Design an enzyme around this catalytic site. Structure first.
Site, PDB file in Angstrom:
ATOM      1  N   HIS A  46      44.905  12.500  80.639  1.00 39.85           N
ATOM      2  CA  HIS A  46      46.127  12.559  81.416  1.00 39.85           C
ATOM      3  C   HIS A  46      47.307  11.976  80.696  1.00 39.85           C
ATOM      4  CE1 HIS A  46      43.105  11.447  84.731  1.00 39.85           C
ATOM      5  NE2 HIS A  46      43.154  12.775  84.675  1.00 39.85           N
ATOM      6  N   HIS A  48      50.163   9.648  81.745  1.00 42.02           N
ATOM      7  CA  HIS A  48      50.617   8.681  82.722  1.00 42.02           C
ATOM      8  C   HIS A  48      52.091   8.404  82.568  1.00 42.02           C
ATOM      9  CE1 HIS A  48      46.695   7.234  84.459  1.00 42.02           C
ATOM     10  NE2 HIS A  48      46.320   8.105  83.553  1.00 42.02           N
ATOM     11  N   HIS A  63      49.522   9.000  87.197  1.00 38.00           N
ATOM     12  CA  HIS A  63      49.762  10.201  86.454  1.00 38.00           C
ATOM     13  C   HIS A  63      51.249  10.593  86.533  1.00 38.00           C
ATOM     14  CE1 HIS A  63      45.339  11.462  87.348  1.00 38.00           C
ATOM     15  NE2 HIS A  63      45.442  10.242  86.838  1.00 38.00           N
ATOM     16  N   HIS A  71      47.182  15.642  92.827  1.00 38.20           N
ATOM     17  CA  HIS A  71      46.396  15.815  91.611  1.00 38.20           C
ATOM     18  C   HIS A  71      45.657  17.145  91.659  1.00 38.20           C
ATOM     19  CE1 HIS A  71      44.115  14.606  88.082  1.00 38.20           C
ATOM     20  NE2 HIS A  71      43.032  15.085  88.698  1.00 38.20           N
ATOM     21  N   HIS A  80      49.827  17.415  89.076  1.00 36.41           N
ATOM     22  CA  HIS A  80      50.786  16.550  88.434  1.00 36.41           C
ATOM     23  C   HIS A  80      51.150  17.123  87.096  1.00 36.41           C
ATOM     24  CE1 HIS A  80      48.381  13.186  90.664  1.00 36.41           C
ATOM     25  NE2 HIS A  80      49.351  13.659  91.435  1.00 36.41           N
ATOM     26  N   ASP A  83      48.423  16.378  84.355  1.00 37.41           N
ATOM     27  CA  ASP A  83      47.023  16.746  84.578  1.00 37.41           C
ATOM     28  C   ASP A  83      46.520  17.743  83.558  1.00 37.41           C
ATOM     29  OD1 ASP A  83      47.023  15.069  86.741  1.00 37.41           O
ATOM     30  OD2 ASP A  83      47.203  16.664  88.286  1.00 37.41           O
ATOM     31  N   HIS A 120      39.731   8.995  79.742  1.00 33.55           N
ATOM     32  CA  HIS A 120      39.012   8.268  80.802  1.00 33.55           C
ATOM     33  C   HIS A 120      37.517   8.196  80.596  1.00 33.55           C
ATOM     34  CE1 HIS A 120      42.147   7.393  83.827  1.00 33.55           C
ATOM     35  NE2 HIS A 120      42.803   8.359  83.222  1.00 33.55           N
ATOM     36  N   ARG A 143      40.245   3.571  82.231  1.00 35.70           N
ATOM     37  CA  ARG A 143      41.095   4.006  81.123  1.00 35.70           C
ATOM     38  C   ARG A 143      40.466   3.460  79.845  1.00 35.70           C
ATOM     39  NH1 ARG A 143      47.076   3.092  84.089  1.00 35.70           N
ATOM     40  NH2 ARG A 143      46.344   4.109  86.006  1.00 35.70           N
TER      41      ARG A 143
END
Ligand code: CU
Ligand code: CU
Ligand code: ZN
Ligand code: ZN
Ligand code: ZN
Ligand code: ZN
Lengths: 153, 153
Positions: A46, A48, A63, A71, A80, A83, A120, A143
């Site tokens: 992602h 962020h 995000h 999401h 988002h 994404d 992730h 994360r």
């Protein structure tokens, strides 16, 4: 054309370099590189909101989501901006990343330069996991590594 | 108002956090924070063109300089956009940074988000050194720590 790059690091063994290239405004962004140190299988990936790694990856915020949408998966209209497609690590823990995304950008309202790229612990469920958390974060867990996306030559 | 932040790291000794804030378009940017692990005295402090840390601080490129001007001091009309005031480390190796700079920006043509902040081995000579190198780099020596400037909350 515009190019960007991100060096991913964390507190475990995950590390990688991800490149971005966009030939024109509002055009597809190509995303590629390699991430090592991962468990075999899918990992959420992602952009962020903040390029703030003062407290590690935790300070990157949610995000990147300028219109407060749900999401979703990369091909959904409701997603988002940040994404991206899950990355896939092989049996040696290596994800060779090959993505084209037309929602992120390297200019304009969806610009991701100066924001944080995060990989992730678990797979992103694409917002399709059947609980509220799914349509916020994809249930991708911790994360593992991150970095700030910078302009490249 | 817009805020940005940068985590400076190198190869162990030098570490810092620098914050940026800009109240309005074309207005002065406040720069502040702290850097540790430096020798006492002055250290050059620059925004370099690329937010590319793939080869450490070496891949950051030259000073940010979109109009191909000479290197100068921060108060000079002729300076690179990235020519910030030297930072001063105390006897314990700590530089408490407090700068207002009217040339850098967090938007527009002089935007530094996505570029690299670098702190150097030696003082920047402000382009008033005794060689041609002075008006290119300020003769500030090696790049001790750097980071990509990111959007902050
Ligand atoms: Cu994420
Ligand atoms: Cu410099
Ligand atoms: Zn076109
Ligand atoms: Zn999301
Ligand atoms: Zn004003
Ligand atoms: Zn300069």
């Amino acid at each position: 054309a515009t190019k960007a790059v991100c060096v991913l690091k964390g507190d475990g063994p995950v590390q990688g370099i991800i490149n971005f290239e966009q030939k024109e405004s509002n055009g597809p962004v190509k995303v590629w590189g390699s991430i090592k140190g991962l468990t075999e299988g899918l990992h959420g990936f992602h952009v962020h909101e903040f390029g703030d790694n003062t407290a590690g990856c935790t300070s990157a915020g949610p995000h990147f989501n300028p219109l407060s949408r749900k999401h979703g998966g990369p091909k959904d209209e409701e997603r988002h901006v940040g994404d991206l497609r899950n990355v896939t690590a092989d049996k040696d823990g290596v994800a060779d990343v090959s993505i084209e995304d037309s929602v992120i950008s390297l200019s304009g309202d969806h610009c991701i330069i100066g924001r944080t790229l995060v990989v992730h612990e678990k797979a992103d469920d694409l917002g399709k996991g059947g609980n509220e958390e799914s349509t916020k974060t994809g249930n991708a867990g911790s994360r593992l590594a991150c970095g700030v996306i910078g302009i490249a030559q």
